[PDB]
């Protein structure tokens, strides 16, 4: 309901179609924090 870019649109499409089913996806503000930490000299990466 708050952070997902491609999660709230699919949830809005699924609710009006009669399917109470969400998708986790990935938040975008955590990607903003990842780009803020990566802008410094500290490396941070998501593994497999």
């Amino acid at each position: 309901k708050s952070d997902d870019v491609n999660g709230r649109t699919k949830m809005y499409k699924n609710i009006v179609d009669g399917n109470h089913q969400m998708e986790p996806g990935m938040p975008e503000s955590f990607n903003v924090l990842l780009k803020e930490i990566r802008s410094l000299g500290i490396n941070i990466e998501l593994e497999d």
């Binding site: 009669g18 399917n19 109470h20 089913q21």
Partner: protein, 79 residues
Amino acid sequence: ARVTVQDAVEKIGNRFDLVLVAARRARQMQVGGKDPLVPEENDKTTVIALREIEEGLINNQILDVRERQEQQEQEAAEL
């Protein structure tokens, strides 16, 4: 009629898998066009699933063997 959930807790004494089995039953009722066993009074699938837990015909054992029987009959009818 849904004001207490305590007898469903007394049936399956974990209070965490009740939400899982009720969500599984309500997902099988909402997505797939299945027939509810308990007669309804124009209620949602949540009340019907919780009353099916309340009557003792649905638990964590019936759904697994029911899905296995459905998979076996669809593999038999797949040809």
